[PDB]
Amino acid sequence: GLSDDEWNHVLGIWAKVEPDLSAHGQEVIIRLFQLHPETQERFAKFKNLTTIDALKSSEEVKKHGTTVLTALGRILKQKNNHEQELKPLAESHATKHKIPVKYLEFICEIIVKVIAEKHPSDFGADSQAAMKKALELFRNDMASKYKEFGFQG
Ligand code: HEM
């Protein structure tokens, strides 16, 4: 996938994200639901969190956003060989939650967005290109794994 000098850009940011992972994680979930309300339907647990304000104030939502980013970071860190980290993610998203590859792309777009919003002097063109290509490789590999579980995407 990526060249070392892209991974360098990816890891470069990521280090700047971890100090506030929790905050980032929650903004990504809230933004997902608010820009794409269909995704909210896949979370039985957040079903009731109807207004925005009930989202901003859920500590389940923050906890789950933190969980989403944590796994991402683990996978970004393995750089190009991240199969042992993806597999369990692919399995649950395919056989359990049943998440389309399109929703995957939706969240990847927001992750990039949230980072840019939060790190204006550091998240530049180059880093943005590289981040995208990293999330794109993740999306692909997820989609591929999905097939081994009989799920389409
Ligand atoms: C690429 C970003 C994503 C990552 C890194 C991520 C990862 C997480 C992790 C670590 C879990 C819990 C462990 C597991 O069940 O495997 C979680 C739960 C789950 N994920 Fe994701 N996820 C991704 C995107 C998506 C998207 C776009 C959706 C669609 C709305 C989604 C919906 C869910 C659901 C429904 C659960 C169940 C939560 C619960 O049991 O209440 N995920 N995911």
Fold and architecture overview:
- Monomeric.
- Pfam families: Globin.
- The protein is 70% helix and 0% strand.
- It is mostly helical.
- It has one domain (1-153): Globins (Globin-like), CATH 1.10.490.
- The longest helix has 23 residues, at 125-147.
- The protein is globular, with a radius of gyration of 15 Å.
- The site of protoporphyrin IX containing FE (HEM) has 16 residues, from α4, α5 and α6.
Q: What helical percentage do the residues reach?
A: 55-70%
Second-tier CATH architecture: Orthogonal Bundle
What radius of gyration results from the CA coordinates? 15 Å
Return the CATH class.
Mainly Alpha
Shape: globular
Number of domains: 1
Please count the helical segments. 7
Binding site for O2: 64
Subcellular location: Cytoplasm, Sarcoplasm
GO molecular function: heme binding; metal ion binding; nitrite reductase activity; oxygen binding; oxygen carrier activity; peroxidase activity
Enzyme class: oxidoreductase
